[PDB]
């Protein structure tokens, strides 16, 4: 009886090793695939930087955008293409997948590879307030900056002096950028 129990356990563990090896293969494939998406996104950002200068006309910015279109097409193609034997890894349908690696019934690891498509990866959040016509000492507060507490800045002057204004506020906000994830800029024009 004991010998048969141990034989069953040895065979089940010998199969669990193969299950683990298959899981390793799948995960390695997914990772070495995502590497190229990282490089492509780097190239996209470089091209956007190259176009963010004003020595280039709309006709050349259009070539930039045409290149970015094809690169992003390739990115989402890699996403919708990488697959093991039909199981699409980098698309979003690889959520809560088990791999029995135990002698008994329900011992397993779980894989929930997120979605990496170009319609779902890069989602920034912009805001912008109405054109301010009033002055006064302002103190911001970004509530729930990290999930627990608030984040109060310092009081900033506005009106017209050298160390005042929306530029001063933008400096004060960009200073604490790494903690809030909130960068600021400005635009001060009075056009008729």
């Amino acid at each position: 009886a004991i010998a048969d129990s141990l034989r069953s356990q040895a065979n089940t563990l010998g199969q669990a090793i193969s299950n683990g090896n298959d899981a390793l293969g799948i995960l390695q494939t997914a990772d070495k695939a995502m590497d190229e998406q990282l490089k492509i996104l780097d190239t996209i950002k470089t091209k956007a930087t190259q176009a963010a200068q004003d020595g280039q006309s709309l006709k050349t910015r259009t070539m930039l955008q045409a290149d970015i279109n094809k690169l992003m097409e390739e990115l989402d193609n890699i996403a919708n293409t990488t697959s093991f034997n039909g199981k699409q890894l980098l698309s979003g349908n690889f959520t809560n997948q088990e791999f029995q690696i135990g002698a008994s019934s329900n011992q397993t690891v779980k894989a929930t590879i997120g979605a990496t498509q170009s319609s779902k990866i890069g989602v920034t959040r912009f805001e912008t307030g109405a054109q301010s016509f009033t002055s006064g000492v302002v103190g911001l507060t970004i509530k729930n900056y990290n999930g627990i507490e608030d984040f109060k800045f310092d009081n900033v002057v506005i009106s017209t002096s050298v160390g005042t204004g929306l530029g001063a506020l933008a400096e004060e906000i960009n200073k604490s950028a790494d903690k809030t994830g909130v960068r600021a800029t400005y635009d001060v024009k009075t056009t008729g």
Binding site: R125, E127, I158, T160, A184, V188
Partner: protein
């Protein structure tokens, strides 16, 4: 001070100090009496797609008070690949 393409008058401030004209500039230049006190506008940019929940103490000065029409939106790569909508652009930071 600069002259726009369409002939409008533009008074830009590089380091963001806020333009305040006191005397009568003279209507006919394009600047109405409501733009004499100007301090520009702020433009925040997060990088996660959740609403920035700003709530300060004296907010009518940065143009985000309890009576200021602000615009906010979140865009993806594919959403940027196309034509930027009119509201999305105002959120981005065009058209002061």
């Amino acid at each position: 001070a600069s002259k726009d393409e369409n002939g409008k008058l533009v008074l830009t401030s590089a380091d963001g100090r806020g333009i305040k004209i006191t005397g009568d500039i003279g209507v006919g230049s394009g600047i109405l009496a409501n733009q004499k006190e100007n301090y520009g506008r702020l433009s925040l940019v997060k990088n996660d797609g959740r609403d920035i929940n700003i709530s300060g103490t004296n907010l009518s000065a940065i143009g985000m008070g309890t009576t200021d029409m602000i615009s906010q939106s979140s865009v993806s790569l594919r959403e940027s690949k196309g034509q930027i909508s009119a509201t999305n652009a105002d959120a981005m930071g065009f058209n002061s």
